[PDB]
Amino acid sequence: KQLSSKFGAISSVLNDIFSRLDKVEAEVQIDRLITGRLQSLQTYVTQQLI
Amino acid sequence: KQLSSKFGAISSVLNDIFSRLDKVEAEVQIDRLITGRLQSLQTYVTQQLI
Amino acid sequence: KQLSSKFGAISSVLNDIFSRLDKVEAEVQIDRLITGRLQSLQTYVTQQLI
Amino acid sequence: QCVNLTTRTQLPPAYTNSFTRGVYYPDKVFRSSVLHSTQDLFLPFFSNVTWFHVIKRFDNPVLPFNDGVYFASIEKSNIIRGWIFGTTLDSKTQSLLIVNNATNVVIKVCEFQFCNDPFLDHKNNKSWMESEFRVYSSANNCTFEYVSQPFLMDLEGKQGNFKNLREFVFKNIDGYFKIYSKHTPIIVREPEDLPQGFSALEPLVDLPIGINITRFQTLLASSSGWTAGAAAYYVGYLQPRTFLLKYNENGTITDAVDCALDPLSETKCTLKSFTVEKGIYQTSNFRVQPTESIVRFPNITNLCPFDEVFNATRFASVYAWNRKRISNCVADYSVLYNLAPFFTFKCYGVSPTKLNDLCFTNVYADSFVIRGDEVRQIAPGQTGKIADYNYKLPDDFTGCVIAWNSNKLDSKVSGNYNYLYRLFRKSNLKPFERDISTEIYQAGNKPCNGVAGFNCYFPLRSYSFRPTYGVGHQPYRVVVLSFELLHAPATVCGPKKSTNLVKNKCVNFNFNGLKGTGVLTESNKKFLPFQQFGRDIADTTDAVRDPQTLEILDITPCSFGGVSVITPGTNTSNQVAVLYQGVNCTEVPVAIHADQLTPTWRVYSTGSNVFQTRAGCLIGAEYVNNSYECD
Amino acid sequence: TGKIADYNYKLPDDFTGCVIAWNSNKLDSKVSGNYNYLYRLFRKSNLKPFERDISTEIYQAGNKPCNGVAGFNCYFPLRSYSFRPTYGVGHQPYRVVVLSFELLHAPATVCGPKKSTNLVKNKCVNFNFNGLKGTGVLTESNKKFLPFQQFGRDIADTTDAVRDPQTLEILDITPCSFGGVSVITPGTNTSNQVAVLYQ
Amino acid sequence: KRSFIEDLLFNKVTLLICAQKFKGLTVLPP
Ligand SMILES: *[C@@H]1O[C@H](CO)[C@@H](O[C@@H]2O[C@H](CO)[C@@H](O)[C@H](O)[C@H]2NC(C)=O)[C@H](O)[C@H]1NC(C)=O
Ligand SMILES: *[C@@H]1O[C@H](CO)[C@@H](O[C@@H]2O[C@H](CO)[C@@H](O)[C@H](O)[C@H]2NC(C)=O)[C@H](O)[C@H]1NC(C)=O
Ligand SMILES: *[C@@H]1O[C@H](CO)[C@@H](O[C@@H]2O[C@H](CO)[C@@H](O)[C@H](O)[C@H]2NC(C)=O)[C@H](O)[C@H]1NC(C)=O
Ligand SMILES: *[C@@H]1O[C@H](CO)[C@@H](O[C@@H]2O[C@H](CO)[C@@H](O)[C@H](O)[C@H]2NC(C)=O)[C@H](O)[C@H]1NC(C)=O
Ligand SMILES: *[C@@H]1O[C@H](CO)[C@@H](O)[C@H](O)[C@H]1NC(C)=O
Ligand SMILES: *[C@@H]1O[C@H](CO)[C@@H](O)[C@H](O)[C@H]1NC(C)=O
Ligand SMILES: *[C@@H]1O[C@H](CO)[C@@H](O)[C@H](O)[C@H]1NC(C)=O
Ligand SMILES: *[C@@H]1O[C@H](CO)[C@@H](O)[C@H](O)[C@H]1NC(C)=O
Ligand SMILES: *[C@@H]1O[C@H](CO)[C@@H](O)[C@H](O)[C@H]1NC(C)=O
Ligand SMILES: *[C@@H]1O[C@H](CO)[C@@H](O)[C@H](O)[C@H]1NC(C)=O
Ligand SMILES: *[C@@H]1O[C@H](CO)[C@@H](O)[C@H](O)[C@H]1NC(C)=O
Ligand SMILES: *[C@@H]1O[C@H](CO)[C@@H](O)[C@H](O)[C@H]1NC(C)=O
Question: Which chain positions lie within coiled-coil regions (chains A, B, C)?
Fold first, then answer.
């Protein structure tokens, strides 16, 4: 359920942000999204270790 | 004591940013600050679990 | 091996950022790099604790 | 005006260490019962300040001023009055004057001509007169004036029992001038050389001279024949340091500890406390520092033909944009920066201000002329007619674009029909490609070649230019510079001069922009003719080829290592030992030098007996034979 | 970078202010040319920010010492402008003003026309002391401030003591009451009654 | 001063990357 959040970006859906934004600066937003997803996965893995 | 650090923003006081800047770039700096504080809180939680 | 990732910046080497950009713009790139490296080091510390 | 005095047998100034004087509040904020770490210009603890004694006796020479000074006078009868600040004192440079003799404090900034002996002392016969107050011979143009209230003064002239101690610290920064002051009474001591104790300093005033200061002179108060009383002052110099300051519940500074004096002070600073229990602690990290700097650029002295490109007689149309190559020359972008209006100069991958410091491998200039309404379409990843069917830049383009107005040249009153552009294209074109084929647009469902008609269109259209057109439609000339960085041996770049080459020493090398620090040695590997830089597992360059001479150099970082402090409890003795983690013990004697090591303290390296363990060498402890229980 | 910045008037990289420039070709431009505005052109080194120089010593370029008056390799360090209305745009005189200031570390000296109001104590209000927007309750304080101090900070570097601009006493700021809420309940089937605990 | 089984135990367990550990990574001794 956590992957539905926007993480402060324009929109949670990945493909729509490419068309509505110029490619010069959409990389920042998609990198923010990828960092948020990586953080969530790392938290889950640590809990599983415990 | 962690929340006295700027985390790369312009100031550690949250009300100063809003009262000195408009609504179009202050969000970037408050975003930096909120990410830093969130990371610190998560680290504290993990230490408590251990 | 993990410090060879660009993390979203223009280049993974720190000296080229300062010698190819003005300070104001270079702030964001070095901020991204430093946040990524801090995150990786924290992950290593947690695994060592376990 | 003053009269020549001379007849002085100067004696070298005295020296005396200052115990704990010279600490001031760094900010106008109230804090209660908390330890705070600050970093600013301070007076190092236990530093040897210069002592001047004036009684017959006349000692007040000019003294250097740099990074602020600390001036402390132990005086009774108000002998010292004011100060003079300047750099030449020759009526050609602005000079300060701070005089608080009897009435008020007068602060003047003016092009004074300070005479040979600035003073207010020598008057008939042995009692002071407020004559020669015009120590300045002339005042041409004075630019700042400020008057305020005076300080605590005294009457008559005495000799002995010098109660009053006045401490001042002066510091100039970013044009501003700042003074902090403190007054201490009832300081009587049979010995000289300052009292022992602690006392903070409050901020007094601030003032914006915004001038250059490098030396200063003291002022004190007929010309031949005068007897003066006892007087003593002390001068010390500031420098950047980090301190740990302790406040109390009443809000006053009570104690402070330095963080660069001794290893014990270092561990006190890193523990954020004033007491440390017995044990081994880990402290600041050892690290050696660079002596000299070197650069290395290719030996080329020709010049690039930027003038021909930017002053070309004719520019080709958009659908046939002209491309030129620049290589094997020295490119100076200063002429591009200033000459001609150049209403738009915008770069993407590199800041233009630094464009004179990099090195490229291939530079391509693409020139054309467009309409004024489409100049915004040159940006990468854009839309519109001109950015789609005539000329498109890649998304990751790394270069610059320069557009300027040329209404005088291209526009013609009769009409300029010479400029053409594609209007109809079957599909979007790939970046950095050109189209010239003239085929009629068969945009219909019929096999039409024809000449004109429905669904049978000539794709090309002619720009029309005339001076009557308003702003936004007059022709604009556009030149785009493209290059790739650091991926090949350099061929064209700026004019920075080279220097000699250093081997087996820690220097700040610079090989075609690779700023870094380390020691360079001769390697024993073979490069390919198309390779210049060698990488490693961490993707940090470690093998380079010198441009001027074809030699292979290998880079390794400076020497470093951890540092630990062995100490018994602060309740017990304060003697400590130092351990250099994981290093042979013959390197640290070599490291012994000032301005070379990150830890400023170096008395311990040439200290007590050194004993090598398997984890470095311990300095400061003797090795006994008999064994005990581990502590 | 350039001549005017590096030789006449340079701003610090951390400048906190404003700049206003306009075109005044209607006044300073002269029909025969204006030569009453001077500017430096020669100097021996870059100057630190907000630095002023007036000396007009003789500039020496070559290794041969220069003295007397201007000559070969011995130039005058000043030059003049040339203003007539027939120059193209970009050469007529431009009048420039720069406003510089520092923010909120000392007693206030100048600000807008916002009206004052009466004071309230021992009540949760939205105070505003010279731009210090916040919330809390203000009480009488007994701590002693030095005359040059205005604000008091805690271990978290946030303000908790202030000095009223109009009357010169000291006010202590403490935050509002807050806490958690818990609900005690039996099973849903048994009943719908609950209890509330304020932690 | 080692026995016979301890010799085999030592030899059966093994402990240039340390050169490329310049990036502030060390190993303290027991
Ligand atoms: C530019 O000047 C340098 C400086 O002398 C020349 O470098 C020399 O190159 C030769 C040939 O490889 C070497 O044997 C010398 O030892 C180099 N000199 C130094 C001081 O290292 C370089 O050759 C010159 N460029 C050209 C094109 O001649
Ligand atoms: C390069 O030219 C070829 C030949 O004209 C183009 O290939 C045609 O592309 C259109 C586009 O839909 C197709 O309808 C044709 O069937 C293709 N013909 C052939 C023979 O392949 C090609 O598109 C051109 N390249 C670009 C980037 O436009
Ligand atoms: C302030 O004045 C001093 C001297 O009055 C200047 O010091 C000069 O420093 C340069 C270093 O590049 C030397 O070459 C000169 O010889 C020094 N001057 C003299 C008279 O010896 C200093 O540069 C000045 N500060 C500024 C910002 O210009
Ligand atoms: C205007 O502001 C001044 C500045 O504080 C006020 O002066 C204070 O007056 C009170 C009452 O007499 C004194 O207790 C304070 O000591 C005064 N301030 C200082 C710094 O001495 C003045 O009263 C104000 N006047 C009005 C009409 O609001
Ligand atoms: C004092 O003597 C010096 C050198 O002897 C001279 O340059 C100066 O003009 C003299 N001052 C006066 C006031 O005569
Ligand atoms: C530095 O202080 C010591 C301590 O008294 C003194 O002996 C020494 O002479 C001083 N330095 C100089 C250059 O005089
Ligand atoms: C000071 O007094 C002496 C002795 O009376 C005299 O020679 C000298 O001229 C006096 N100085 C002045 C400036 O009057
Ligand atoms: C172009 O020519 C003009 C006059 O001929 C000259 O002032 C200008 O500097 C030239 N531009 C370049 C880049 O050389
Ligand atoms: C410190 O030493 C004194 C005497 O040497 C002793 O009375 C005191 O108890 C000691 N304090 C601690 C904390 O060890
Ligand atoms: C230092 O190196 C020398 C020569 O290799 C060696 O004899 C000595 O034992 C070494 N000492 C330490 C402490 O590493
Ligand atoms: C320790 O023993 C060695 C070997 O007998 C001897 O050379 C050395 O002097 C002794 N040191 C002390 C402090 O007794
Ligand atoms: C209703 O909830 C109670 C819990 O208090 C449970 O004992 C009972 O079995 C439940 N009845 C149902 C689920 O029908």
Answer: 1-30
* C-alpha to C-alpha distance for E148 and D180, rounded to whole angstroms: 13
Give the pair of three-digit tokens for residue A31.
């990198």
D562 touches chain F (CB under 8 A): yes
**Would you give the DSSP letter of residue D43?**
P
Task: Give the residue numbers in E contacting B (CB under 8 Å), as ranges.
Answer: 103-104, 131-134, 155-158
Architecture, CATH, for domain D14-286: Sandwich (2.60)
Nearest to D513 by CA among E2, E6, C21: C21
Q: How far is CA A23 from the centre of its chain?
A: 17
User: D-chain residues within 8 Å CB-CB of E59?
Assistant: none
Chain E residues in contact with D208 by the CB 8 A cut-off are 50
Token code pair at residue E149: 């101090």
Q: Over D221-232, what HEC string results?
A: CCCCCCCCCCEE
Write the DSSP symbol of residue D359: B
Instruction: Indicate which residue's Cα is closest to atom 10 of ligand 5.
Output: D4
**Pair of tokens at residue D78:** 């108000």
* A50: nearest CB among B31, B42, B49: B49
* Nearest CA distance, D28 vs chain E (angstrom): 5
Question: Are the beta carbons of D424 and D443 closer than 8 angstroms?
Answer: yes
Tokens of D112: 């004074």
Which region holds residue A22: left if phi is over 0, alpha if psi is between -120 and 50, else beta? beta
The CA distances from residue D156 to D74, D82, D128, in Å, are 17, 18, 9
In one-letter notation, the amino acid at residue D1 is Q
D66 CB less than 6 Å from ligand 6?
A: no
Measured distance CA(D318)–CA(E35) in Å, rounded: 45
A49 touches chain B (CB under 8 A): no
Query: Pairing mode, if any, of strands D322-326 and D360-370?
Result: antiparallel
Report the C-alpha gap between D187 and D166 in whole angstroms. 11
Residue C42: closest C-alpha in chain B? B43
F22 vs chain D: nearest CA distance in angstroms?
8
Residue D315: burial class (beta carbons within 10 Å; 0-12, 13-18, 19+): buried
CA-nearest of D429, D54, D354, D373 to D229 is: D54
Q: Is the N-terminal amide bond of D125 cis, ω within 30° of 0? A: yes
D59 and D11 Cβ atoms separated by less than 8 Å: yes
Tokens of residue D626, six digits: 């008999």
Name which of A28, A31, A46 is nearest C46 (Cβ-Cβ): A46
Ligand 6 proximity of D17 Cβ (cutoff 6 Å): yes
Work out the widest C-alpha separation in chain B, in whole angstroms: 43
Instruction: For residues D85 and D131, give the distance between their C-alpha atoms in angstroms, rounded to a whole number.
Output: 21
Which helix (H) or strand (E) segment holds residue E3: the answer is helix E3-7
Mutation to probe ligand 5, out of D6, D116, D122 (largest number of atoms < 8 A from CB): D116
Query: Which parts of D190-340 fold into alpha helices (H)?
Result: 263-271, 306-310, 334-338
Q: Which ligand is in closest contact with the Cα of E189?
A: 12
Q: Can you read off the two tokens belonging to residue D534?
A: 């060698």
Q: Nearest-CA distance from B15 to chain E in Å?
A: 7
